[PDB]
Amino acid sequence: MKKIVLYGGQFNPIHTAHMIVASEVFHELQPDEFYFLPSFMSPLKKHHDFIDVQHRLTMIQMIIDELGFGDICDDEIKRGGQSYTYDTIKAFKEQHKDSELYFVIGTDQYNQLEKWYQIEYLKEMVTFVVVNRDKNSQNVENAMIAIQIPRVDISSTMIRQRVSEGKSIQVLVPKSVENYIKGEGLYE
Template sequence: MEIILYGGSFDPIHIGHAFVANEVFQQFKPDKFIFIPAGQSPHKNTKPNVSDEHRLHMIQQTIDYLQFGEIDTFEIEQAGKSYTYHTVLYLKKKYKNCKLKILIGYDQYEVIDKWYNLEAITSLASFIVVNRSRDELTLREPFIPFTLPRMDVSATDIRMRIHNGQSVKCLLLADVEQYIREEHLYEEKKSD
């Protein structure tokens, strides 16, 4: 069984996330494509801006739109920081003998040497690296380059635009934008 793991804060999940997920899914055709929202990123000092419940709802709306994928809440159910190493062990135990690929952007690849227990992770899984901020990728083994047309969309920018009352049209899926508006998410520094 081939599994692609797509982790992140997804705060909020946006059109860039959906585009990457769709292109990678269509290219690799995994048996499972799993979105795993982070609880507390080890590389960030702050927790997500909205509740896990809101993030899960927006991810599910995106999955419904894409017509593939599932959510695993392993990381948000853990206390403390979310380490990919623990997630990989969990998935390898849950799906015996699976071939696991971890989908990351080039920004994460640039700091990959800071990841907890990287050597163990690379012995259990491979990485698909998307050219988030670059036009071309030259990577070392066992990292698989995946080049897409650049789409510079940022969750930080989206949160700031909503907070400032600016438009986010074309940056979010329509259902996700509607949900954010109905729930008044990101209108203040911290929302439920």
């Protein structure tokens, strides 16, 4: 019964397009609970030798403050290693047995779901909720939920690139995160 949405990501940094995704999914699905799920290391992505956790968590909190909804699921941070969603979900479900689970992904992940660890099992444990990225609409199978959002081509990679360049990131991230990135010297 009780509807729980988890929204997974590197969030390095979280940005305005992540907010649009969270907001649209949350307003459409009206879940009982909404979790931003920051990875320790996102499978299929490269990582630095040192994995920042604290700056990422702080900026996520800033998005929660601005949105007026949400919580952070720290499971993957605590676990460490490669953050396979199957493992996370198996353990999370054990702790939330009376709840229907939703996992929010964009087009880019949806197009490579066959590369996800234990995906045949994972498809049985969550309802994937897919938002359009780099296109204006996404089609999904009946077992999944497609949510159409205004197309906004912002990435975390874009944010880090601009900052290292010395290029402004105003609006692309909320003012709180912009000031935080600047005061902390992130990505410089």
